[PDB]
Design a protein around this ligand. Structure first.
Ligand SMILES: *[C@@H]1O[C@H](CO)[C@@H](O[C@@H]2O[C@H](CO)[C@@H](O[C@@H]3O[C@H](CO[C@@H]4O[C@H](CO)[C@@H](O)[C@H](O)[C@@H]4O)[C@@H](O)[C@H](O[C@@H]4O[C@H](CO)[C@@H](O)[C@H](O)[C@@H]4O)[C@@H]3O)[C@H](O)[C@H]2NC(C)=O)[C@H](O)[C@H]1NC(C)=O
Ligand SMILES: *[C@@H]1O[C@H](CO)[C@@H](O)[C@H](O)[C@H]1NC(C)=O
Length: 335
């Protein structure tokens, strides 16, 4: 037996984690899936259950049933939870997107959502992904109902409100993260993250960490050196770093040949190793689910897939064993 989380913890990390799409999908009652989940992970992110559209479906009407169902699974397994997410362009309730708003009114909507959601779960959340995917690749703000109506201030206010809501209930230890893709290597987007952090902190607003989604493509994964350098840039700026949504997807079939799987193993390996080699402030690695049969990829991109550590019948791939090697600080044995 290998237990990825056990290995990660032996080498200074908080956990090895995964997203799980519970209670939204058949994972919820898939015993084989749940057995691998319990056996390998010390953190679980809700893939959907804490999102705006599953927490506040009508204005100021909160129903946390899905999130509570998710948390019982995670907590029963002894796993920490990266709560995800408060403010994002996608998966916002219809009452928000299908109504017209002033900046003042939508600011209040945002504030009320943050306070009620953060205070409901309280310290059961290790952290929150407060704002999700706020940047374009060029470092400008990306479009969302929030940005388009409120302007740039929405971003700073989201963190201010999360901080205030947690302070009110004595939960200052719940960490506040910004989470995005395309910020795992050097470039304009990463630089823009650092600027956002600087701007938050000048306003006396707490930001504890950055979440590096790490939705990579097999054969096009940024190098160990580049990923390590970028993590060090964040850490040197007094940010904790988590790899939050790691997967390495194939742009085309085949997904399961020897050469394909070796490349994918190497891509997972360097991504994990970059966190190991960054030291303790890279707190851990979370994959965006671990079973190809439940992966987000094929429904997002026609013909892409095979992105996860385990295949559809829950056989561990070379990438699983490569991650285990990385977590132990050992050379890749299957690359
Ligand atoms: C996880 O689950 C997936 C499925 O979801 C499994 O994926 C399968 O993995 C197999 C083993 O790697 C793949 O089969 C091999 O395919 C090779 C390429 O074959 C093709 O040529 C045929 C015939 O014209 C075409 O149909 C194909 O499209 C390709 O052009 C074969 O060369 C290979 O066959 C050889 O013969 C013996 C059997 O007598 C093999 O044992 C030997 O290894 C040798 O290579 C073989 O059939 C299969 O394609 C693949 N399925 C898909 C849809 O990709 C994984 O194995 C599971 N496990 C893991 C860890 O991922
Ligand atoms: C809350 O959501 C749960 C989870 O889907 C659902 O079953 C139920 O209809 C909702 N409860 C209330 C009181 O609106």
């Amino acid at each position: 037996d290998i237990d990825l989380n056990k290995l990660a913890q032996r080498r200074g990390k908080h956990w090895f984690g995964t997203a799980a799409d519970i209670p939204g999908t058949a994972e919820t009652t898939d015993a084989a899936y749940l057995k691998v989940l319990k056996q390998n992970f010390g953190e679980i992110t809700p893939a959907n259950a804490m999102k705006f559209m599953y927490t506040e479906t009508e204005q100021n009407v909160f129903n946390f049933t899905e999130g509570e169902q998710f948390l019982e699974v995670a907590e029963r397994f002894g796993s920490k939870v990266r709560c995800h997410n408060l403010v994002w362009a996608s998966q916002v309730s219809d009452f928000v997107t299908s109504k017209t708003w002033t900046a003042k009114e939508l600011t209040a909507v945002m504030k009320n959502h943050i306070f009620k959601t953060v205070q409901h779960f309280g310290r059961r959340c290790y952290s929150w992904d407060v704002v999700n995917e706020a940047l374009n690749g060029d470092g400008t703000f990306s479009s969302s109902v929030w940005y388009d109506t409120i302007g740039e201030e929405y971003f700073y206010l989201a963190f201010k409100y999360a901080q205030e809501a947690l302070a009110q209930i004595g939960a200052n230890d719940v960490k506040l993260y910004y989470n995005d893709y395309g910020i795992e290597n050097p470039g304009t987007k990463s630089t823009a993250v650092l600027q956002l952090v600087s701007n938050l902190r000048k306003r006396g607003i707490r930001i504890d960490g950055v979440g590096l989604e790490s939705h990579f493509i097999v054969g096009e994964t940024p190098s160990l050196a580049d990923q390590l350098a970028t993590k060090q840039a964040y850490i040197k700026a007094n940010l904790d770093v988590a790899v939050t949504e790691l997967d390495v997807r194939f742009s085309t079939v085949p997904y399961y040949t020897a050469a394909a799987q070796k490349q994918q193993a190497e891509d997972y390996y360097v991504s994990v190793a970059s966190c190991m080699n960054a030291g303790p402030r890279c707190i851990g690695v979370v994959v965006w689910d671990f079973d190809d049969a439940y992966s987000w990829v094929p429904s997002a991109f026609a013909g892409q897939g095979g992105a996860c550590l385990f295949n559809n019948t829950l056989e561990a791939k070379p990438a699983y064993y490569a991650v285990a090697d990385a977590l132990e600080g050992k050379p890749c044995s299957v690359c």
